[PDB]
């Protein structure tokens, strides 16, 4: 039984934080008999299974754990990925639009004023969401991850997320009512040819006098 191993490079700036928590990461993985190695010279994180590993799938979650830590997710949040229900998703957003100003402006719309819009989306979906560059990193239960994707993608297509926040609250209230479970909730939801040669220039007054 050869060992399945996964390596994830991390930027140099996370070296200080990762070093302090590594004893905690080792303890967290050691509960599942997964060995880990932190390489400060190459700046890499390695997780590898051992002979005592009894659960085959944990190595995947160990791999996701090092990925989240490298992308600046805090360890107390990142360590939740080891739970079966938790999952991580990475959403690309750079490919939606071509105008830089429109791109930044719509991205800011996700964060919202004071970060209110992001926090509202995090609370309702029970998901940890981080907005980075040309991507949005989300972590939480699978149903929450699905909801985050639709908001993030629709936000880049000119739909304000506050609409999605409002629909989520209504859907949560509706889900608690048994009578309307069968009924559709759509009613309750808010609703000449180019020329290659230029024209000549108008001569200056002096040129007329010349």
């Amino acid at each position: 039984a050869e060992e399945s191993s996964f390596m994830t490079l991390f930027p140099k700036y996370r070296e200080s934080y990762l070093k302090t928590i590594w004893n905690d990461v080792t303890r967290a993985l050691d509960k599942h008999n997964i060995a880990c190695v932190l390489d400060l010279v190459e700046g890499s994180m390695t997780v590898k299974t051992t002979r005592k590993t009894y659960d085959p799938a944990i190595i995947l979650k160990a791999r996701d754990l090092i990925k989240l830590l490298a992308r600046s997710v805090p360890f107390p949040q990142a360590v939740k990925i080891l739970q079966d229900d938790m999952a991580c998703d990475v959403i690309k957003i750079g490919n939606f639009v071509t105008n830089k100003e429109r791109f930044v402006k719509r991205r800011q719309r996700l964060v919202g004023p004071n970060g209110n819009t992001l926090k509202a989306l995090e609370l309702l979906t029970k998901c940890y969401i981080l907005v980075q560059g040309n991507t949005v990193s989300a972590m939480g239960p699978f149903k929450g991850l699905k909801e985050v994707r639709r908001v993030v993608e629709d936000c880049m297509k000119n739909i304000h997320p506050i609409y999605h926040i409002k629909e989520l609250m209504i859907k949560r209230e509706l889900a608690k009512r048994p009578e309307l479970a069968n009924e559709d909730w759509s009613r309750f939801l808010p609703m000449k040819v180019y020329t290659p040669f230029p024209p000549a220039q108008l001569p200056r007054k002096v040129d007329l006098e010349i």
């Binding site: 919202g112 004071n114 509202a120 609370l123 029970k126 980075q132 609250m169």
Partner: protein
């Protein structure tokens, strides 16, 4: 925009997360969150008509302590922004004078003592 419940939840998201589905309905909310929620709502309605000096009064703290709280709080904000700025994380825009509202601001209730901004410089 005029939906009070949605806007109220959005502005009050930070308090609810700090002092915690999520109990955002006025009947369900209990504990410190309900005390902080009521104060935030009452202040907002007051700012429109009440004179700025009298509506908001920073709690009295001695000299040496308050500079200590501000210096540490600014240090926490600088670390929070620098770690995000060096990374890719996008942070909500803040006016130049005002301090950014980090998670610690809502949890430690620092705002009532240090205040939103150093009023002397905003005057200068």
């Amino acid at each position: 925009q005029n939906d009070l419940e949605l806007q109220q939840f959005l502005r009050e998201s930070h308090l609810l997360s700090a002092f915690n589905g999520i109990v955002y309905q006025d009947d369900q909310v209990i504990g410190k969150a309900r005390s902080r929620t009521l104060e935030m709502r009452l202040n907002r309605l007051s700012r429109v008509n009440g004179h700025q000096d009298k509506i908001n009064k920073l709690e009295k703290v001695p000299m040496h302590i308050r500079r200590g709280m501000i210096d540490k709080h600014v240090k926490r904000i600088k670390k929070y922004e620098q770690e995000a700025a060096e990374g890719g994380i996008v942070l909500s825009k803040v006016k130049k004078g005002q301090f950014r509202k980090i998670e610690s601001t809502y949890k430690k209730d620092i705002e009532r003592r240090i205040g939103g901004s150093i009023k002397a410089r905003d005057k200068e």
